[PDB]
Amino acid sequence: MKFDPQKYRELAEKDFEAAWKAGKEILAERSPNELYPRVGFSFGKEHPLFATIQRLREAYLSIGFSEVVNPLIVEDVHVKKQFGREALAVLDRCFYLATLPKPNLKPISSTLTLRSHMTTGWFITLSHIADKLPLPIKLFSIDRCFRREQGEDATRLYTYFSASCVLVDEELSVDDGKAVAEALLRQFGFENFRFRKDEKRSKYYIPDTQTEVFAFHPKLVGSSTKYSDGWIEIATFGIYSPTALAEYDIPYPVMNLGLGVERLAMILYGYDDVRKMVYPQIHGEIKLSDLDIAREIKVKEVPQTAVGLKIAQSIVETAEKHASEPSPCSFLAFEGEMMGRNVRVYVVNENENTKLCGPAYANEVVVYKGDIYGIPKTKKWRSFFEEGVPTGIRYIDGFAYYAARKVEEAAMREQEEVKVKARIVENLSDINLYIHENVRRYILWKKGKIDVRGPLFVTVKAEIE
Amino acid sequence: MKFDPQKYRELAEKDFEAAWKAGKEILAERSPNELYPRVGFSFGKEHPLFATIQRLREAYLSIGFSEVVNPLIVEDVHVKKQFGREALAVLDRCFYLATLPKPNVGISAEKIRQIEAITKREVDSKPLQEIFHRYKKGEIDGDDLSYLIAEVLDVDDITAVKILDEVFPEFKELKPISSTLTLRSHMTTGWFITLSHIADKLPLPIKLFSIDRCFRREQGEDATRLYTYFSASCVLVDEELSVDDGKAVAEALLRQFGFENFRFRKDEKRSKYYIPDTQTEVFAFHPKLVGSSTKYSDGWIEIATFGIYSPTALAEYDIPYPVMNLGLGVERLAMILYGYDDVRKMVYPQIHGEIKLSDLDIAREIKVKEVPQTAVGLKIAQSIVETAEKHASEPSPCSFLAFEGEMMGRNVRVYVVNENENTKLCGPAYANEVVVYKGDIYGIPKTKKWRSFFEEGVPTGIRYIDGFAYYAARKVEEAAMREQEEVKVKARIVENLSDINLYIHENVRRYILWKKGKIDVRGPLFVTVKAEIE
Amino acid sequence: MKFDPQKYRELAEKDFEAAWKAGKEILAERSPNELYPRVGFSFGKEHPLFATIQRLREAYLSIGFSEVVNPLIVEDVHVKKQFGREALAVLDRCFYLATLPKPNLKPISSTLTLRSHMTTGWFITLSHIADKLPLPIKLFSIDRCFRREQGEDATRLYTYFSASCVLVDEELSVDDGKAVAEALLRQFGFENFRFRKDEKRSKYYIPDTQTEVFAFHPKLVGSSTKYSDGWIEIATFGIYSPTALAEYDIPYPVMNLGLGVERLAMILYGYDDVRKMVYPQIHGEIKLSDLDIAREIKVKEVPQTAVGLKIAQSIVETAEKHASEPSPCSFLAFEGEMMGRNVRVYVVNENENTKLCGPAYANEVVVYKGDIYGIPKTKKWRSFFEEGVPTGIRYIDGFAYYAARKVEEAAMREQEEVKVKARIVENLSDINLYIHENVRRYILWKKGKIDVRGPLFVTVKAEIE
Amino acid sequence: MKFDPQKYRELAEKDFEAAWKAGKEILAERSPNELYPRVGFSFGKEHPLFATIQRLREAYLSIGFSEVVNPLIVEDVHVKKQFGREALAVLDRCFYLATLPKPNVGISAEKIRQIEAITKREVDSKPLQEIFHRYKKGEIDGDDLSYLIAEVLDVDDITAVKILDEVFPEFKELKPISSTLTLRSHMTTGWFITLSHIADKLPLPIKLFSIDRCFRREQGEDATRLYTYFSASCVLVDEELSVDDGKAVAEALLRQFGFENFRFRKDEKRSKYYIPDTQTEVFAFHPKLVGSSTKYSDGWIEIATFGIYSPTALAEYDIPYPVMNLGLGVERLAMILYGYDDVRKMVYPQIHGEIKLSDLDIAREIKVKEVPQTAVGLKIAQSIVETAEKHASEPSPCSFLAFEGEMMGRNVRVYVVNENENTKLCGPAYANEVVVYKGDIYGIPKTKKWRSFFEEGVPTGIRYIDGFAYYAARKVEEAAMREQEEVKVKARIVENLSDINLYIHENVRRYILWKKGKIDVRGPLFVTVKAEIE
């Protein structure tokens, strides 16, 4: 709360520490659902695909390549202009754009196609600058592409992200393509590189230039896959055929390196199933931390009055000690008045031989590995208490508030007495605690479980007159 | 050059100032194309579009929303689930994914295929009527190097590219076949699918965003729209929602891009997927816009849209809770930020010939053709400058010793002369520099008339004589190989760079023209350099 | 609110649009302090100094230079090792580190000094790698420095940020220093560059290499300063003297370019007074947008019941039309019951000749250029309404809630009748509206003003029995 | 090389495959140091410290806090205002700003200054007893080029650097004088000052952060602390606050750096500026730590501190509202993130000799000394390979024509021979490659014994013969200048790179040693190359 500079200012002149301890007065008093971890900040979280993409843009920029956006929708006449006589073989794997005919039904395919890879648009973009700008030209672009490869879902998908770049100079070896791969690929951890000529020998790449980069990343050695040796084919590249360049008037050669993003994204953040990565919202993959599950566990009914708080706060204060005395046996915990009439609180196990409070009065709720447990803090549960997030809410704590608010209902209902009792704990409601219906459908979905059981055996009678 | 730390230290410890002025020995004597701005560093540059997309990402993340990738290609059945009836109206402005079928090598084109000379072009190889069926079964692109380079011999595709052209005129009959798959017009289409799988399993409120591509059809015109665009979108899932939440987000979002005031109007469309009377149009005022060659002189521009998803479409995906959806269109926001007027010219600039080199970049490309090769020549020219730079007003004729030394092991002595008379040793435009300005290369002299060019353009630092000197510096060294005895190189008038030793790579040359630039390098340089290489 | 998929699902099968409009039912109903712009998200905002710093790191990295952290605290013996015989002249402008002597009072100066510029630490850092790593070496570092230059505050400060870098090769011209300046400086807008030899001729720079970069930035032409010509000295650089390198065993030369950050930061974000930039929290410079001032303007007392809302909501609904009828004249607006007893609301200007509602019943509150106004939406105030942020809260609106909640106090106080009246409006309290005491001390600090005046002249009587 | 778009197009339009295989004409024939990995691109690298500082910034911003710069140098009066009495305890671990006074050229050193030969070293120049007073008034560093280069003649500082050393032994008596100015130990010291000016003028809640330097004194040891460090700090000003708010922030903050679980203990110090019983110590568990050469095997590490500012110190600055303060220490967080064990080795690595080149970087530095210069020689060597690579097992002696052509305009014919007998044309280690592995350069042959080196290291691609071939390729071209007629270059055993034509810049060489690396290039290369250049 807002204090007074002077007041405290002067107050410190006399006995300092007496005024220092006086400071504790400004601290706010917190209710049960107002303290950590039932209250916490949040924050956005980026997707591994995109992250990697940005991480790739910089990587490219860092080795000199300027960014550019290439044509995405194109007339197949281009694929044809490039692949020469192999052009049709390719047009198969590509998609075509079809539209609906205006009924002044049945889509009418057209000559347009979604690019199967960046290269389709490259020749188009390089066509306008290849002979006007000073060499070398270093362009790159990380955008979307569309392939039809078997039209699968498991192995691959309909749209991927190419991390393309092109180098336009008067003289180019396959080497420039080698350098660019290492410079680019190294900024991600890859340490050793190996290149092997590609058999596919795509016709748009000068014969015997098309290569396949193989990079080693220590993050892989030991991986639960065939990438355990540490190496993985991570990118391909070649040098555009004069046959294709000619088709677009590009006089100088051109080196073109392509990077398969979803793969890199996977290597980096360690996902195994591309789909489970790029599309986890669908593939059931969704998680909440124990700390999160925790925060979501909150007291249902809680004392709505200043006194109410100091009531249950006492109820427990006694059970924390008198939960032993051989029952029957009654103890008094509170003495004061709320709203208008004086009040006193009673605690006793009316029943015959046994103890006052059940053996579960001291069971704390903790979340662990996805499950919500109700357990005593015994040298047996340690790991659950030292690897999970202990709610901080104990059985008696959970209980108290219920009573401290239940007598609060009688205090305003004119009533004179109420006997709030509690035996077993079949779940949370029984311990006066809840979780939004959604975290619930969650726990189940993530096939986790809630084990909040226990013999509380504690009753509280209160009289207001 | 590297020096000796000890020496330079034990000498400086005693005598400092002497060591200091000595340092100059470690610097490097650069030739002519080894000087600024003939030398420089290069750096990559980002594209306004991708740039904004990044800013946009951070922006969102900075307000709670977590990133997600939504379904791009979807069954139009979804659209018809998000518009009920008004669906068709949309699917007209959408694209469907067509695709080439396989060469029907059976039935229709089989019977009449078995009534001619099946095969004449000698190829033999047992009837691979199954290796062709595995095609009408499941093949792809990287499968040609199997039924040729491993079938009818012949490497990779040296005969496969034509064997499928001459003997197989069939393939040239395939036609893409439309389907029910579509390229989402806007993000929303994919939100229902994604929110579908989690609208009730994760804790509320749900804040998700995604800046990805979307395809639309609108009068095939590069100007009045583009086939593909970007849509920085977000969805807010929570129990209780009001259009306010749409504003609150639109505010906090735009506010990180300058915009200082917002106004929201109700959209006329009144689309079906949005609750009735919630589809809002958000207008924001941004300073950079105040007074411009645009229609947003007053500063206000409509930058996004948003509304609540009808509890109707939500059910179509079994989503219990209501959901807010804001949709900032990137391309514009980018133009406003990076100052562009024409969408197409901005996003796709190389294509629209919007390339451009700077004064400084042109100046950097103007190299010196004929340049020395021996430490001597470097001095010969360096010297030819001295005598020619000083004795510029000497009523010709008249020789002038410029250099005296041994080059390549031969006594060398070159002089700066003039043949005619009634004039001066060197022409008037001998001390003319090449200044690039406003995109045109110039060969002018410093004046109170040219100031504008030397203080706005960027001087190359090369003057006609400085250019020539290097040409001569080469000739003399040449004779030092042809062991001649007398070379008298001479240059009259200047009409271009050639007549100055200067030049520029062909590409920069074409740029100049393409850009309507102009090179102006003329003037009386007149100054011969007679050499006496013994 | 959470709806039912099926219910709405089927409901749409019959008449769609009847079910569509049925959708409006899920939308939450908002109270006065719950709608825009009295509710809005917030977000961090970086400081121009730092921003520019990061923006500088990338710039450097983008031209190849790797990052490194140099020594900050150093024995003056270094300044001495470098400046040779000029070393003392320098030691003047530098600070020294002094500590308190442990009393088993008066600080005891020491031999340590806070670096006056990066160069002091450069020689130290280059000492270990200059001859072990492959050339060229390109290092950079943007860190803090300490100068004593006149020990001023106005002109300059005690600590600045140097954006240093060093280039270690076998052969180096002054040119490398020129290139690096343009490459670095261009990534910020600077278009044309001019270098002039520095007279200072610092002794640690090979004689006649020390230069001063002058860069042109169109963002300056027309500036309200001497940087109107567009050019500004933005950085200096030279080539380390063999005399100094020798002192640290560096065999090869070294080019060193230094960038004065606070200046660049200023050019970029356009601040004139460095201090008003780097330290605005102190120099009174603190702002809130009209939109912000707006959001902070909220209804004080508002209907705490479901009905209460639909009450004031009606009170206004009538004044919005009957604020004309020649007074006296009474109208009824509400008919229903709250909590338990039926209720009716009256509105009349008991007084003699005039109109029912004062001429200010339709005055909306809007914030503009820093002031909080209470004005009618007349074709005279337009600009205030089209450049500012209209609260949306009008006089009657502000009023209503007061009444609708005032009768709510009688409804629970057992009472039978209440006459809430209102004549003039001397300020906000009078219109039932407030602003946190802090935005208030703000408006004043930013010497802005609040003009919420007006003759509301509107009374409301209500009877509950 | 550039080609002709037309030609290559009108030829491919008719005959494709023919144009294709023709493309190879435009590629470039690279020499030997023009191949990978002898050629490569370079990129800058960030420093873990600055890196984390950036992440840290974003992190904060991502949770509402706005950036601010706080007072670094402050009057210890502030500290004494934030600890009341326990102040001194702090000021001991702080640094005070001392500073050199001015040469007292008056009184004490004036009287005895006027009883000797005032000036003998001829300098004259009217009594500048005022130009020296303006020094005891207000001078600086850039003021020497005024009372010398514009006073007693002599350029800049050629005589000013010694005139102040010989005739002025005074200066060598100055001593820094302590003051009351200090270098803030932690951020907090500056927060009070900054929060001072706005704690009540801006809207609540206030969220400010700042990742800046701070200086501390703790047993002058680079290991057990450092004089300067970084403190990513923040302050939360609001009416009602509880230690919870300290946790909530600590959580949301650390959570963006991996840490998955937190535990907060109450700090024993119980510092004065923090309310009693609020100074909390925050502990976070981060996976990267589980089981390590550190003391955090269990994953938990104490990463930050926080508490509420005593309404006491707050008043000392007239701050009405309470304030939360969290203080993440950067350097550690950086180590955990970038995996470092020793503070000093991480932040200041060059100094602690923690430099390192990679296998691939070393392989890139191994160049070829003697390399051809004429298109011919490139083939001569290229050829010397063929004949020597094939006829490797030919019981010597025996010549072998390798090249037949005209070099520089002279009939050239070189042969691969052997003099001795009972052996083979080329030695056994003729086909040995130079593979860099584990930091040592090797000259080994491919084997089932060396696999580990060819699959883990990085081969240079140069084999002894491949190296030699280039040496020879040079000799022959040399005689083409000395117009000789017979050069018989020969190489016996190999002991180093020199005996292979290979070499590495001196700096990489020193690196190897400094790093305890090892070069191993030995073996019988034996293979002479007799040339017959007519």
PDB file of C-alpha atoms in Angstrom, chain C residues 301-303 400-412 415 418-420 462 464:
ATOM      1  CA  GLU C 301     -19.408   4.622  -9.243  1.00  0.00           C
ATOM      2  CA  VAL C 302     -21.141   2.183 -11.577  1.00  0.00           C
ATOM      3  CA  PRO C 303     -24.263  -0.061 -11.272  1.00  0.00           C
ATOM      4  CA  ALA C 400     -26.682   7.933 -15.362  1.00  0.00           C
ATOM      5  CA  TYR C 401     -24.427   5.272 -13.803  1.00  0.00           C
ATOM      6  CA  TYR C 402     -24.270   7.447 -10.688  1.00  0.00           C
ATOM      7  CA  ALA C 403     -28.049   7.391 -10.341  1.00  0.00           C
ATOM      8  CA  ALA C 404     -28.576   3.807 -11.523  1.00  0.00           C
ATOM      9  CA  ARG C 405     -26.264   2.878  -8.642  1.00  0.00           C
ATOM     10  CA  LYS C 406     -27.606   5.477  -6.233  1.00  0.00           C
ATOM     11  CA  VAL C 407     -31.129   4.016  -6.355  1.00  0.00           C
ATOM     12  CA  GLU C 408     -29.355   0.696  -5.986  1.00  0.00           C
ATOM     13  CA  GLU C 409     -28.176   1.924  -2.575  1.00  0.00           C
ATOM     14  CA  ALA C 410     -31.740   2.742  -1.543  1.00  0.00           C
ATOM     15  CA  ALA C 411     -32.987  -0.573  -2.915  1.00  0.00           C
ATOM     16  CA  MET C 412     -30.732  -2.302  -0.376  1.00  0.00           C
ATOM     17  CA  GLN C 415     -35.538   3.226   1.510  1.00  0.00           C
ATOM     18  CA  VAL C 418     -34.155   9.118  -3.759  1.00  0.00           C
ATOM     19  CA  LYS C 419     -33.611  12.313  -5.733  1.00  0.00           C
ATOM     20  CA  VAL C 420     -30.239  12.320  -7.488  1.00  0.00           C
ATOM     21  CA  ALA C 462     -36.736   7.176  -8.266  1.00  0.00           C
ATOM     22  CA  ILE C 464     -38.893   1.879  -4.669  1.00  0.00           C
TER      23      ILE C 464
END
